[PDB]
């Protein structure tokens, strides 16, 4: 029978049969079932002997610190893992029962409680976010470092599916072609919830976060360090949701970490959602002189050819910035940012194109100077602004297609134009007139310089209106105007110079300019003949 049994049954060992995880690992052939809670010590390392194993978790890994998995064969899968700290730390909860953010340091300190979730452990970044909290926090709530972390070290082709936990963290160190798939809402600890760190060895490649969601955590939900997906854009975040990150939803690191670069290139960031981060929704900048990366002489600060594939992202409720990045030659599309306390978008980009961007009700707490900022020479095609609550400062950018109830005096761009519209109709509702206004921002950002109006004569249903063409004078909009059909008179009312017109008032040849001659109660006309010569004629008399 043994011979037969050996050939007809699925191989799997279970943790309940062993004293340590290494013992179970050594006995494993195909499957490994975690069927009993396992308390690990920080630094506990398991060697899987290069075996391609399928690890099924039906119990918890309990401990503060890291449980290190090494030498898993390409193709290994870990499903249902649950990490939980042994320590219950002090956490702050900077929001109200009505989901309003608390910004006052004293109010935030008052939320202190010991819990493994529904809040996070304060870090130094909180000292910046809630000014004065550093001196108000009790000493036992400062400098905590609790995280139950599953660290996968220097493995290739390992996938972690449906992972969860309390004060949990997942770290892929020196890994390639690894994936965090369908994270089952783990509640984060002190460190990043999902981190792909490749500071040593080759640049990380093939590393992804696919689907799923995370909640809380003291810093960023997803973090990448020194990853390059190559031209194939093999890596990134797709279909993910981050809720209430203590720092940002998704972050690509910037600057030097250790003695090398922590920057990232050629990754995808698509079809993802970030809601209520304490700092930013997406922090995709690379610069904060670049050991291990492009020298500043090749690419100036904020002008690295990051080349990320960015599309279809939604951000809501950030206490910081909704969408942030830097880089040169980028194409960004279909971004929707709503209800953020700081800038909806903070873009330190140059020679980049943004298509179909919607920034709706951001910088609601005036944390920044504007709702959307762009530093370099960029192109914006399709920009929706204003929901129900400067708006845009992009000094060197050319923009087309803004929609929304924007206050024109709060727009600053290099050039704004609608070059390809067809025949136009201006439809006016709730007013006695329709209007097409012109505003030269160089002259004034607050006053329209001229207009074409249509005004009702009489009342509704009169079938009569008068058209008026206006110009500003003495900083008084519409000070001077020509009217057609005022009071249904069917004639044109023409403005004349109130005094003797000077020779220089007339512009073109074969034109005449009426002027008043008060001493004779006469209208005169300064005429510039077809030949360019001036002559003054009598136009109308008593």
Short mmCIF file of C-alpha atoms in Angstrom, two decimals:
data_model
loop_
_atom_site.label_atom_id
_atom_site.label_comp_id
_atom_site.label_asym_id
_atom_site.label_seq_id
_atom_site.Cartn_x
_atom_site.Cartn_y
_atom_site.Cartn_z
CA UNK A 1 0.00 0.00 0.00
CA UNK A 2 2.76 2.48 0.90
CA UNK A 3 4.04 2.38 -2.70
CA UNK A 4 0.54 3.10 -3.97
CA UNK A 5 -0.25 5.75 -1.36
CA UNK A 6 3.05 7.49 -2.15
CA UNK A 7 1.98 7.83 -5.77
CA UNK A 8 -1.65 8.78 -5.39
CA UNK A 9 -1.76 11.39 -2.66
CA UNK A 10 -0.91 15.10 -2.60
CA UNK A 11 2.13 15.92 -0.44
CA UNK A 12 1.77 18.48 2.31
CA UNK A 13 3.24 18.91 5.80
CA UNK A 14 1.52 20.90 8.50
CA UNK A 15 3.06 23.12 11.18
CA UNK A 16 1.12 21.39 13.97
CA UNK A 17 3.50 18.41 13.51
CA UNK A 18 6.65 20.40 14.12
CA UNK A 19 8.24 22.43 16.91
CA UNK A 20 9.73 25.10 14.65
CA UNK A 21 8.89 26.56 11.25
CA UNK A 22 12.34 25.55 9.92
CA UNK A 23 11.60 21.91 10.78
CA UNK A 24 8.34 22.04 8.82
CA UNK A 25 10.16 23.82 5.98
CA UNK A 26 12.84 21.12 5.86
CA UNK A 27 10.21 18.36 5.64
CA UNK A 28 8.13 20.13 2.95
CA UNK A 29 7.99 18.75 -0.59
CA UNK A 30 5.04 20.42 -2.30
CA UNK A 31 2.60 21.94 0.15
CA UNK A 32 3.06 23.45 3.59
CA UNK A 33 0.01 24.21 5.72
CA UNK A 34 0.25 26.70 8.59
CA UNK A 35 -2.46 25.24 10.78
CA UNK A 36 -1.48 26.60 14.18
CA UNK A 37 -0.47 30.04 15.43
CA UNK A 38 3.25 30.45 15.45
CA UNK A 39 5.08 32.90 17.69
CA UNK A 40 8.32 33.96 16.04
CA UNK A 41 11.25 35.95 17.37
CA UNK A 42 12.50 39.00 15.50
CA UNK A 43 15.07 37.89 12.97
CA UNK A 44 13.88 34.28 12.85
CA UNK A 45 15.07 33.02 9.45
CA UNK A 46 13.66 30.09 7.48
CA UNK A 47 15.59 28.42 4.67
CA UNK A 48 13.28 26.71 2.15
CA UNK A 49 16.08 24.91 0.32
CA UNK A 50 15.15 26.26 -3.12
CA UNK A 51 11.94 24.25 -3.08
CA UNK A 52 8.93 25.42 -5.09
CA UNK A 53 6.36 25.32 -2.33
CA UNK A 54 2.71 26.21 -1.99
CA UNK A 55 2.23 27.67 1.49
CA UNK A 56 -1.36 27.75 2.71
CA UNK A 57 -1.97 29.80 5.85
CA UNK A 58 -4.88 29.09 8.14
CA UNK A 59 -3.35 30.53 11.34
CA UNK A 60 -1.24 33.53 12.43
CA UNK A 61 2.47 34.39 12.60
CA UNK A 62 2.71 36.35 15.85
CA UNK A 63 5.65 38.53 16.84
CA UNK A 64 7.16 42.02 16.77
CA UNK A 65 9.95 42.27 14.24
CA UNK A 66 10.77 40.27 11.11
CA UNK A 67 10.11 36.67 10.16
CA UNK A 68 12.51 36.09 7.27
CA UNK A 69 11.76 33.62 4.45
CA UNK A 70 14.76 32.80 2.23
CA UNK A 71 15.54 30.45 -0.63
CA UNK A 72 11.99 29.82 -1.85
CA UNK A 73 12.03 28.41 -5.37
CA UNK A 74 10.76 30.33 -8.37
CA UNK A 75 7.03 29.75 -8.56
CA UNK A 76 6.39 29.53 -4.83
CA UNK A 77 3.07 30.95 -3.50
CA UNK A 78 2.10 32.02 -0.03
CA UNK A 79 -1.63 32.42 0.51
CA UNK A 80 -3.65 33.83 3.39
CA UNK A 81 -0.73 34.84 5.62
CA UNK A 82 -1.72 36.87 8.71
CA UNK A 83 0.92 38.90 10.59
CA UNK A 84 0.20 40.25 14.08
CA UNK A 85 2.43 42.05 16.57
CA UNK A 86 2.72 40.85 20.17
CA UNK A 87 2.81 44.48 21.34
CA UNK A 88 -0.30 46.70 21.43
CA UNK A 89 1.09 50.22 20.89
CA UNK A 90 -0.21 53.71 21.49
CA UNK A 91 -1.92 55.06 18.36
CA UNK A 92 -3.35 58.49 17.36
CA UNK A 93 -6.49 58.84 15.25
CA UNK A 94 -6.49 62.32 13.55
CA UNK A 95 -10.13 62.30 12.38
CA UNK A 96 -13.60 62.70 13.89
CA UNK A 97 -16.78 60.59 14.10
CA UNK A 98 -17.98 62.66 11.15
CA UNK A 99 -14.75 61.83 9.33
CA UNK A 100 -13.43 65.38 9.57
CA UNK A 101 -9.65 65.67 9.82
CA UNK A 102 -8.22 67.02 13.06
CA UNK A 103 -5.36 69.45 12.43
CA UNK A 104 -4.87 70.78 15.94
CA UNK A 105 -1.98 69.07 17.83
CA UNK A 106 -3.87 69.10 21.18
CA UNK A 107 -6.97 67.56 19.59
CA UNK A 108 -4.83 64.78 18.02
CA UNK A 109 -2.99 64.03 21.29
CA UNK A 110 -6.39 63.64 22.94
CA UNK A 111 -7.17 60.68 20.60
CA UNK A 112 -4.36 58.54 22.06
CA UNK A 113 -5.27 54.89 22.83
CA UNK A 114 -3.60 51.49 22.87
CA UNK A 115 -4.76 49.50 19.89
CA UNK A 116 -3.45 47.41 17.01
CA UNK A 117 -5.64 49.25 14.51
CA UNK A 118 -7.97 52.22 13.88
CA UNK A 119 -5.06 54.64 14.14
CA UNK A 120 -1.29 54.61 13.83
CA UNK A 121 1.92 55.08 15.84
CA UNK A 122 3.20 58.71 15.62
CA UNK A 123 6.50 59.23 13.77
CA UNK A 124 8.71 62.29 13.15
CA UNK A 125 6.68 63.19 10.03
CA UNK A 126 3.75 63.82 12.39
CA UNK A 127 5.85 66.48 14.11
CA UNK A 128 5.70 68.35 10.80
CA UNK A 129 2.07 67.54 9.96
CA UNK A 130 0.61 68.58 13.36
CA UNK A 131 2.87 71.41 14.56
CA UNK A 132 3.57 71.30 18.29
CA UNK A 133 2.59 67.68 18.71
CA UNK A 134 6.20 66.75 19.43
CA UNK A 135 6.13 68.57 22.74
CA UNK A 136 2.56 67.48 23.61
CA UNK A 137 2.92 63.73 23.08
CA UNK A 138 3.60 61.74 26.29
CA UNK A 139 7.00 59.97 26.19
CA UNK A 140 5.45 56.48 25.97
CA UNK A 141 3.71 57.44 22.69
CA UNK A 142 6.91 58.68 21.05
CA UNK A 143 9.46 56.68 19.07
CA UNK A 144 7.48 53.42 18.94
CA UNK A 145 8.56 50.90 16.33
CA UNK A 146 6.02 48.09 16.28
CA UNK A 147 5.54 46.07 13.09
CA UNK A 148 5.06 42.31 12.57
CA UNK A 149 6.89 41.96 9.25
CA UNK A 150 7.08 39.07 6.77
CA UNK A 151 10.35 39.65 4.95
CA UNK A 152 10.93 37.72 1.69
CA UNK A 153 14.67 37.98 1.04
CA UNK A 154 16.50 37.71 -2.29
CA UNK A 155 13.91 35.46 -3.90
CA UNK A 156 12.64 35.40 -7.50
CA UNK A 157 9.13 34.59 -8.68
CA UNK A 158 7.44 34.42 -5.30
CA UNK A 159 3.85 35.60 -4.93
CA UNK A 160 2.02 36.54 -1.75
CA UNK A 161 -1.77 36.26 -2.05
CA UNK A 162 -4.57 37.45 0.20
CA UNK A 163 -2.25 38.56 2.97
CA UNK A 164 -3.65 40.31 6.06
CA UNK A 165 -2.73 41.26 9.62
CA UNK A 166 -2.70 43.78 12.48
CA UNK A 167 0.32 46.13 12.76
CA UNK A 168 1.46 44.09 9.73
CA UNK A 169 4.19 44.72 7.16
CA UNK A 170 5.41 42.93 4.03
CA UNK A 171 8.95 43.46 2.81
CA UNK A 172 10.48 42.13 -0.39
CA UNK A 173 14.23 42.72 0.00
CA UNK A 174 16.42 42.16 -3.09
CA UNK A 175 13.58 40.38 -4.87
CA UNK A 176 12.65 40.20 -8.53
CA UNK A 177 9.46 39.09 -10.29
CA UNK A 178 7.57 39.02 -7.03
CA UNK A 179 3.97 40.04 -6.52
CA UNK A 180 1.72 41.15 -3.68
CA UNK A 181 -1.67 40.01 -4.98
CA UNK A 182 -5.15 40.79 -3.59
CA UNK A 183 -3.93 42.00 -0.18
CA UNK A 184 -6.86 41.34 2.13
CA UNK A 185 -6.85 44.69 3.91
CA UNK A 186 -3.96 44.29 6.35
CA UNK A 187 -3.86 47.04 9.00
CA UNK A 188 -0.36 48.54 8.95
CA UNK A 189 2.34 48.96 11.56
CA UNK A 190 5.23 51.38 11.90
CA UNK A 191 6.94 50.52 8.58
CA UNK A 192 5.59 50.57 5.01
CA UNK A 193 2.82 48.02 4.51
CA UNK A 194 4.20 46.73 1.19
CA UNK A 195 7.82 47.54 0.39
CA UNK A 196 9.92 46.51 -2.62
CA UNK A 197 13.48 47.43 -1.64
CA UNK A 198 16.39 46.73 -4.03
CA UNK A 199 19.22 48.86 -2.72
CA UNK A 200 21.70 45.99 -3.13
CA UNK A 201 22.27 43.85 -6.18
CA UNK A 202 20.44 44.56 -9.41
CA UNK A 203 17.68 47.12 -9.78
CA UNK A 204 14.34 45.55 -8.85
CA UNK A 205 12.29 44.31 -11.80
CA UNK A 206 8.99 42.49 -12.24
CA UNK A 207 7.79 43.57 -8.76
CA UNK A 208 4.06 44.30 -8.51
CA UNK A 209 1.19 45.14 -6.21
CA UNK A 210 -1.92 43.78 -8.01
CA UNK A 211 -5.40 44.37 -6.64
CA UNK A 212 -6.36 44.39 -2.99
CA UNK A 213 -6.27 47.05 -0.30
CA UNK A 214 -4.50 48.13 2.89
CA UNK A 215 -5.54 50.35 5.80
CA UNK A 216 -3.73 52.59 8.29
CA UNK A 217 0.02 52.22 8.93
CA UNK A 218 2.37 54.98 10.09
CA UNK A 219 4.04 55.63 6.74
CA UNK A 220 3.30 54.83 3.07
CA UNK A 221 1.09 51.86 2.08
CA UNK A 222 3.21 50.91 -0.92
CA UNK A 223 6.89 51.88 -1.32
CA UNK A 224 9.43 51.19 -4.06
CA UNK A 225 13.21 51.66 -3.72
CA UNK A 226 15.60 51.32 -6.68
CA UNK A 227 13.26 49.51 -9.07
CA UNK A 228 13.38 49.81 -12.85
CA UNK A 229 10.70 47.99 -14.85
CA UNK A 230 12.62 48.53 -18.09
CA UNK A 231 11.02 49.56 -21.39
CA UNK A 232 8.54 46.76 -20.85
CA UNK A 233 7.31 48.60 -17.71
CA UNK A 234 7.54 45.32 -15.79
CA UNK A 235 6.48 46.43 -12.28
CA UNK A 236 4.22 48.81 -10.41
CA UNK A 237 0.80 49.17 -8.84
CA UNK A 238 -2.38 48.11 -10.65
CA UNK A 239 -5.94 47.96 -9.30
CA UNK A 240 -4.97 48.77 -5.71
CA UNK A 241 -6.74 50.70 -2.93
CA UNK A 242 -4.99 52.44 -0.01
CA UNK A 243 -7.00 53.80 2.90
CA UNK A 244 -5.72 56.21 5.58
CA UNK A 245 -1.95 55.86 5.07
CA UNK A 246 -0.03 57.64 7.86
CA UNK A 247 2.07 59.09 5.07
CA UNK A 248 1.19 58.43 1.39
CA UNK A 249 -0.85 55.88 -0.55
CA UNK A 250 1.84 55.04 -3.10
CA UNK A 251 5.43 56.31 -2.95
CA UNK A 252 8.51 55.93 -5.15
CA UNK A 253 11.47 57.01 -3.02
CA UNK A 254 13.61 60.06 -3.66
CA UNK A 255 17.28 60.81 -3.10
CA UNK A 256 20.17 58.85 -1.69
CA UNK A 257 19.49 56.06 0.78
CA UNK A 258 22.70 54.73 2.26
CA UNK A 259 25.40 55.21 -0.35
CA UNK A 260 23.14 54.61 -3.35
CA UNK A 261 20.03 55.83 -5.20
CA UNK A 262 16.52 54.87 -3.99
CA UNK A 263 14.88 56.20 -7.18
CA UNK A 264 12.58 54.31 -9.56
CA UNK A 265 12.04 54.15 -13.32
CA UNK A 266 9.72 52.57 -15.85
CA UNK A 267 6.90 51.43 -13.51
CA UNK A 268 3.14 51.35 -14.02
CA UNK A 269 0.73 53.18 -11.65
CA UNK A 270 -2.76 52.50 -13.01
CA UNK A 271 -6.39 51.87 -12.10
CA UNK A 272 -5.71 52.60 -8.44
CA UNK A 273 -7.46 54.53 -5.68
CA UNK A 274 -6.01 56.34 -2.66
CA UNK A 275 -8.39 57.66 0.01
CA UNK A 276 -7.75 59.72 3.16
CA UNK A 277 -3.93 59.65 3.31
CA UNK A 278 -2.41 61.87 6.04
CA UNK A 279 0.12 63.07 3.51
CA UNK A 280 -0.21 62.42 -0.24
CA UNK A 281 -2.27 60.21 -2.52
CA UNK A 282 0.52 59.40 -4.98
CA UNK A 283 4.08 60.58 -4.38
CA UNK A 284 5.88 59.69 -7.62
CA UNK A 285 8.80 62.12 -7.43
CA UNK A 286 12.41 60.98 -7.67
CA UNK A 287 14.39 64.08 -6.58
CA UNK A 288 14.18 65.82 -3.20
CA UNK A 289 24.94 64.54 -6.72
CA UNK A 290 23.09 61.29 -7.43
CA UNK A 291 25.30 58.38 -6.37
CA UNK A 292 24.33 55.26 -8.31
CA UNK A 293 22.07 57.24 -10.63
CA UNK A 294 22.19 59.91 -13.40
CA UNK A 295 24.49 62.82 -12.58
CA UNK A 296 22.97 66.27 -12.06
CA UNK A 297 25.01 67.40 -15.08
CA UNK A 298 23.14 64.97 -17.31
CA UNK A 299 19.70 65.54 -15.82
CA UNK A 300 19.03 68.58 -13.66
CA UNK A 301 17.07 68.26 -10.44
CA UNK A 302 13.45 67.14 -11.03
CA UNK A 303 14.19 66.35 -14.70
CA UNK A 304 14.99 62.64 -14.68
CA UNK A 305 13.47 60.55 -17.53
CA UNK A 306 11.35 58.51 -15.07
CA UNK A 307 9.12 57.23 -17.84
CA UNK A 308 6.39 55.80 -15.61
CA UNK A 309 3.13 54.64 -17.25
CA UNK A 310 0.50 56.62 -15.28
CA UNK A 311 -3.21 56.33 -16.02
CA UNK A 312 -6.66 56.19 -14.44
CA UNK A 313 -5.97 57.16 -10.83
CA UNK A 314 -8.47 58.45 -8.27
CA UNK A 315 -7.56 60.28 -5.06
CA UNK A 316 -9.95 61.55 -2.38
CA UNK A 317 -9.64 63.09 1.08
CA UNK A 318 -5.88 63.64 1.31
CA UNK A 319 -4.81 65.85 4.20
CA UNK A 320 -1.76 66.61 2.05
CA UNK A 321 -1.32 66.65 -1.75
CA UNK A 322 -3.50 64.47 -3.98
CA UNK A 323 -1.09 63.77 -6.82
CA UNK A 324 2.62 64.68 -6.78
CA UNK A 325 5.56 63.93 -9.09
CA UNK A 326 8.59 65.32 -10.90
CA UNK A 327 10.45 64.32 -14.05
CA UNK A 328 10.85 65.25 -17.69
CA UNK A 329 9.16 63.94 -20.83
CA UNK A 330 6.27 62.31 -18.98
CA UNK A 331 2.78 61.51 -20.36
CA UNK A 332 0.10 61.43 -17.66
CA UNK A 333 -3.57 60.75 -18.24
CA UNK A 334 -6.99 60.41 -16.70
CA UNK A 335 -6.34 61.58 -13.16
CA UNK A 336 -9.23 62.50 -10.83
CA UNK A 337 -8.52 64.23 -7.48
CA UNK A 338 -11.34 65.31 -5.19
CA UNK A 339 -11.69 66.94 -1.78
CA UNK A 340 -8.08 67.35 -0.64
CA UNK A 341 -6.81 69.71 2.12
CA UNK A 342 -3.57 70.61 0.31
CA UNK A 343 -2.89 70.92 -3.44
CA UNK A 344 -4.74 68.51 -5.71
CA UNK A 345 -1.62 68.26 -7.86
CA UNK A 346 1.94 69.42 -7.23
CA UNK A 347 3.89 68.92 -10.43
CA UNK A 348 7.62 69.59 -10.67
CA UNK A 349 7.65 68.40 -14.27
CA UNK A 350 9.16 69.78 -17.48
CA UNK A 351 8.38 68.96 -21.13
CA UNK A 352 5.53 66.70 -20.00
CA UNK A 353 1.92 66.27 -21.12
CA UNK A 354 -1.14 65.92 -18.89
CA UNK A 355 -4.35 64.76 -20.53
CA UNK A 356 -7.86 64.81 -19.04
CA UNK A 357 -7.07 65.92 -15.48
CA UNK A 358 -9.88 66.65 -12.97
CA UNK A 359 -8.91 68.64 -9.79
CA UNK A 360 -12.14 69.07 -7.82
CA UNK A 361 -12.28 71.01 -4.51
CA UNK A 362 -8.66 70.83 -3.33
CA UNK A 363 -6.39 73.01 -1.13
CA UNK A 364 -9.54 73.33 1.00
CA UNK A 365 -7.44 74.16 4.09
CA UNK A 366 -5.05 76.55 2.29
CA UNK A 367 -2.07 74.39 3.05
CA UNK A 368 -0.58 75.40 -0.28
CA UNK A 369 -0.63 78.43 -2.54
CA UNK A 370 -2.76 76.74 -5.21
CA UNK A 371 -4.93 73.80 -6.22
CA UNK A 372 -2.58 72.77 -9.01
CA UNK A 373 1.03 73.79 -9.50
CA UNK A 374 3.27 73.01 -12.50
CA UNK A 375 6.83 74.37 -12.50
CA UNK A 376 8.24 73.60 -15.95
CA UNK A 377 7.24 73.97 -19.61
CA UNK A 378 4.35 71.51 -19.84
CA UNK A 379 1.16 70.95 -21.82
CA UNK A 380 -2.25 70.43 -20.20
CA UNK A 381 -5.04 69.19 -22.47
CA UNK A 382 -8.34 68.97 -20.63
CA UNK A 383 -8.50 70.38 -17.10
CA UNK A 384 -11.61 70.33 -14.95
CA UNK A 385 -11.57 72.66 -11.94
CA UNK A 386 -13.94 73.52 -9.11
CA UNK A 387 -16.58 71.42 -7.47
CA UNK A 388 -18.92 72.95 -4.96
CA UNK A 389 -16.43 74.84 -2.77
CA UNK A 390 -4.48 80.76 -7.06
CA UNK A 391 -6.41 77.85 -8.45
CA UNK A 392 -3.77 77.01 -11.04
CA UNK A 393 -0.24 78.35 -11.19
CA UNK A 394 1.59 76.85 -14.17
CA UNK A 395 3.72 79.87 -15.27
CA UNK A 396 5.46 78.06 -18.11
CA UNK A 397 2.66 75.83 -19.32
CA UNK A 398 0.27 75.95 -22.22
CA UNK A 399 -3.28 74.88 -21.44
CA UNK A 400 -6.45 74.15 -23.44
CA UNK A 401 -9.90 72.87 -22.41
CA UNK A 402 -10.58 74.08 -18.86
CA UNK A 403 -14.15 73.41 -17.65
CA UNK A 404 -15.67 74.51 -14.36
CA UNK A 405 -16.78 77.55 -12.36
CA UNK A 406 -13.24 78.86 -12.00
CA UNK A 407 -12.54 82.48 -10.94
CA UNK A 408 -10.43 83.76 -13.92
CA UNK A 409 -8.32 86.01 -11.67
CA UNK A 410 -6.99 82.82 -10.04
CA UNK A 411 -5.53 81.37 -13.23
CA UNK A 412 -1.88 81.81 -14.14
CA UNK A 413 -0.53 79.96 -17.19
CA UNK A 414 1.81 80.87 -20.05
CA UNK A 415 -0.83 80.46 -22.74
CA UNK A 416 -4.51 79.49 -22.73
CA UNK A 417 -6.29 78.78 -26.06
CA UNK A 418 -9.24 76.99 -27.71
CA UNK A 419 -7.94 76.80 -31.28
CA UNK A 420 -10.37 74.24 -32.66
CA UNK A 421 -13.93 75.05 -31.63
CA UNK A 422 -16.68 75.06 -34.23
CA UNK A 423 -19.59 77.48 -34.57
CA UNK A 424 -20.46 78.70 -31.07
CA UNK A 425 -23.57 79.50 -29.05
CA UNK A 426 -23.47 81.14 -25.60
CA UNK A 427 -26.58 80.10 -23.67
CA UNK A 428 -27.54 82.30 -20.70
CA UNK A 429 -29.78 81.05 -17.88
CA UNK A 430 -31.26 83.04 -15.03
CA UNK A 431 -30.09 86.40 -16.40
CA UNK A 432 -31.50 89.23 -18.48
CA UNK A 433 -28.44 89.04 -20.73
CA UNK A 434 -25.98 86.69 -22.40
CA UNK A 435 -22.31 87.60 -22.68
CA UNK A 436 -19.00 86.84 -24.27
CA UNK A 437 -16.27 88.59 -22.31
CA UNK A 438 -12.62 89.26 -23.14
CA UNK A 439 -9.94 89.63 -20.44
CA UNK A 440 -6.31 90.55 -21.13
CA UNK A 441 -4.49 89.32 -18.03
CA UNK A 442 -1.48 91.52 -18.83
CA UNK A 443 -3.82 94.53 -18.49
CA UNK A 444 -5.81 93.20 -15.51
CA UNK A 445 -6.46 89.77 -14.02
CA UNK A 446 -9.60 91.06 -12.29
CA UNK A 447 -11.41 93.19 -14.86
CA UNK A 448 -12.73 92.24 -18.27
CA UNK A 449 -11.37 94.54 -21.00
CA UNK A 450 -14.29 94.27 -23.40
CA UNK A 451 -17.45 92.34 -24.15
CA UNK A 452 -20.16 91.41 -26.59
CA UNK A 453 -23.54 91.33 -24.80
CA UNK A 454 -27.12 90.63 -25.73
CA UNK A 455 -29.67 92.23 -23.34
CA UNK A 456 -33.46 91.84 -23.08
CA UNK A 457 -35.54 94.86 -24.24
CA UNK A 458 -38.64 95.03 -22.06
CA UNK A 459 -39.20 91.61 -20.54
CA UNK A 460 -39.46 87.90 -21.18
CA UNK A 461 -41.24 87.02 -24.41
CA UNK A 462 -40.79 90.48 -25.90
CA UNK A 463 -38.95 89.02 -28.90
CA UNK A 464 -36.52 91.96 -28.67
CA UNK A 465 -32.99 92.46 -27.36
CA UNK A 466 -30.11 94.82 -27.98
CA UNK A 467 -26.54 93.86 -28.71
CA UNK A 468 -23.70 95.90 -27.23
CA UNK A 469 -19.97 95.94 -27.89
CA UNK A 470 -17.96 97.39 -25.01
CA UNK A 471 -14.47 98.52 -23.92
CA UNK A 472 -12.91 99.35 -20.53
CA UNK A 473 -11.76 102.90 -19.78
CA UNK A 474 -10.44 104.28 -16.49
CA UNK A 475 -10.46 100.76 -15.00
CA UNK A 476 -14.26 100.77 -15.37
CA UNK A 477 -15.41 97.76 -17.38
CA UNK A 478 -17.89 98.48 -20.19
CA UNK A 479 -17.28 102.21 -19.82
CA UNK A 480 -17.57 102.82 -23.59
CA UNK A 481 -19.98 101.00 -25.92
CA UNK A 482 -21.75 100.71 -29.27
CA UNK A 483 -25.34 99.43 -29.13
CA UNK A 484 -27.63 97.88 -31.74
CA UNK A 485 -31.46 97.93 -31.14
CA UNK A 486 -31.53 99.50 -27.65
CA UNK A 487 -35.22 99.80 -26.61
CA UNK A 488 -36.10 98.11 -29.90
CA UNK A 489 -35.32 101.35 -31.76
CA UNK A 490 -33.71 99.32 -34.62
CA UNK A 491 -30.80 101.74 -34.90
CA UNK A 492 -27.17 101.79 -33.80
CA UNK A 493 -26.11 104.04 -30.90
CA UNK A 494 -22.57 105.25 -31.54
CA UNK A 495 -20.13 106.72 -28.97
CA UNK A 496 -18.15 109.83 -29.95
CA UNK A 497 -15.08 111.51 -28.46
CA UNK A 498 -16.39 113.90 -25.72
CA UNK A 499 -13.96 116.61 -26.85
CA UNK A 500 -11.69 117.73 -29.67
CA UNK A 501 -10.11 114.54 -30.99
CA UNK A 502 -6.34 114.61 -31.36
CA UNK A 503 -4.75 113.54 -34.65
CA UNK A 504 -3.36 110.40 -33.02
CA UNK A 505 -6.76 109.06 -31.91
CA UNK A 506 -7.53 107.75 -35.40
CA UNK A 507 -5.81 104.50 -36.37
CA UNK A 508 -6.58 103.41 -39.94
CA UNK A 509 -6.91 105.09 -43.34
CA UNK A 510 -10.37 105.45 -44.87
CA UNK A 511 -11.96 105.71 -41.42
CA UNK A 512 -13.61 108.58 -39.55
CA UNK A 513 -13.94 109.26 -35.82
CA UNK A 514 -16.78 111.47 -34.58
CA UNK A 515 -15.97 114.05 -31.91
CA UNK A 516 -17.76 116.76 -29.95
CA UNK A 517 -17.23 120.47 -30.54
CA UNK A 518 -18.97 122.00 -27.55
CA UNK A 519 -18.54 125.64 -28.65
CA UNK A 520 -20.87 125.20 -31.62
CA UNK A 521 -23.04 122.28 -30.46
CA UNK A 522 -21.69 120.35 -33.43
CA UNK A 523 -20.41 116.89 -34.14
CA UNK A 524 -17.21 116.91 -36.17
CA UNK A 525 -15.37 114.03 -37.78
CA UNK A 526 -11.63 113.48 -37.82
CA UNK A 527 -11.15 111.69 -41.15
CA UNK A 528 -8.11 109.76 -42.27
CA UNK A 529 -8.51 109.78 -46.03
CA UNK A 530 -7.73 106.76 -48.23
CA UNK A 531 -4.35 108.40 -48.91
CA UNK A 532 -3.52 108.60 -45.22
CA UNK A 533 -4.00 112.37 -44.88
CA UNK A 534 -6.10 113.82 -42.05
CA UNK A 535 -8.93 116.30 -42.51
CA UNK A 536 -11.59 117.51 -40.04
CA UNK A 537 -15.13 117.71 -41.33
CA UNK A 538 -18.43 118.85 -39.89
CA UNK A 539 -20.61 115.80 -39.35
CA UNK A 540 -23.80 117.10 -37.68
CA UNK A 541 -25.18 120.54 -36.76
CA UNK A 542 -28.23 122.35 -35.38
#
